[PDB]
């Protein structure tokens, strides 16, 4: 906990993350653009992120933003049963997502992420730590010092494990259960990106400036 305190990761979550029914896809994309601004503020509050070279900060956020945002709105959505809660104060119902052509990815979000976060009562410290692990992705291409990012990831998951063992000692598998939602998060992030590139290609869905910038090459 010493060089990567979970208390500071929780503080980062609480600092950035405080409904009416919502083309729902336009509303979803507007909320994503809004939350990219919030994501930069979140990352600056994660210990040692701001100490990396600027180029590496850019690389990590460009590599991770979609998984980072999906984890956040999925955890936010534990509070409803049949919908996703957008950061703009709008709810997207299952029926609304399906009627807009994005039912399959909606269903994956609810079945692989929201419902599983709810089932295990994943807390905000655990969410923040999983997000910090995603942020400190040492496989991100072009990093100036991948081993330094590897080291930061290791500090996060060591702190997370100690947190879980202290708060949930009756659940010895909890730490692994948390980490084992990251393959699903990766898949769902890739599928969301595929949709966004298609929306950009067809041109019938407004995409605001920061979301558009994240869809630039490379």
């Amino acid at each position: 906990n010493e060089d990567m305190p979970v208390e500071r990761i929780l503080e980062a979550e609480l600092a950035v993350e405080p409904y009416v029914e919502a083309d729902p896809v336009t509303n979803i994309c507007q909320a994503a653009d809004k939350q990219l601004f919030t994501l930069v503020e979140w990352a600056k509050r994660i210990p040692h992120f701001s100490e990396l070279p600027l180029d590496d900060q850019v690389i990590l956020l460009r590599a991770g933003w979609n998984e980072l945002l999906i984890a956040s709105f999925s955890h936010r959505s534990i509070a409803v049963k049949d919908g996703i809660l957008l950061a703009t104060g709008l709810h997207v119902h299952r029926n609304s997502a399906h009627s807009a052509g994005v039912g399959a990815i909606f269903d994956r979000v609810l079945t692989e992420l929201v419902s599983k976060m709810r089932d295990m009562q994943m807390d905000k410290t655990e969410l923040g730590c999983l997000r910090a692990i995603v942020l400190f992705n040492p496989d991100s291409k072009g990093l100036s010092n991948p081993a330094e990012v590897e080291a930061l990831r290791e500090k996060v998951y060591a702190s997370l494990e100690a947190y879980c063992k202290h708060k949930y000692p009756e659940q010895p598998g909890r730490f692994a259960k948390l980490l084992l939602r990251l393959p699903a998060l990766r898949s769902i992030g890739l599928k969301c990106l595929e949709h966004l590139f298609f929306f950009k290609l067809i041109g019938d869905t407004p995409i605001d400036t920061f979301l558009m910038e994240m869809l630039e090459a490379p």
Partner: peptide, 10 residues
């Protein structure tokens, strides 16, 4: 490149 992201990281 990445004009908005760089500005916000400043």
């Amino acid at each position: 490149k990445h004009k908005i992201l760089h500005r916000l990281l400043q």
